[PDB]
């Protein structure tokens, strides 16, 4: 449950940002549209990867 599928390492508890279930490290949170740093309020994440909210702001 508590695992970052990006680096393959497991997550801590009070660090990793959760994208509704699927937990990823703060550093491992990289967009799938543009591919930059991301750590939002709402945060965008689809069932096709994890994105930056900035991508949808532009789009
Ligand atoms: Zn990670
Ligand atoms: Zn992006």
Report in angstroms the alpha-carbon separations of 18 from 22, 52, 58, 59.
6, 13, 23, 23
**12 Cα–ligand 1 center, Å:** 10
Cβ neighbours of residue 41 under 8 Å, at least 6 residues apart? Answer: 53
SS3 of residue 54 by DSSP: helix
Whole-angstrom Cα distance, residue 7 to residue 29? 10
Taking the C-alpha atoms of residue 19 and residue 54, their distance in angstroms, rounded to an integer, is 16
CATH code for the part of the protein at 1-59: 2.10.110.10
DSSP labels, 1-49 = --B-TTTSPBP-SSSPEESSS-EE-TTT-B-SSS--B---SS--EEBTE
| Alpha carbon of 43 to ligand 1 centroid (Å) | 17
Which bound ligand lies closest to the C-alpha atom of 57? 2
Q: Which token pair is 14?
A: 């009070």
């Amino acid at each position: 449950a508590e695992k970052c599928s990006a680096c393959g390492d497991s997550v801590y508890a009070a660090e990793k940002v959760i994208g509704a279930g699927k937990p990823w490290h703060k550093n491992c949170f990289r967009c799938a549209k543009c591919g930059k740093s991301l750590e939002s309020t709402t945060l965008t994440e689809k069932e096709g990867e994890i994105y930056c909210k900035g991508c949808y702001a532009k789009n």
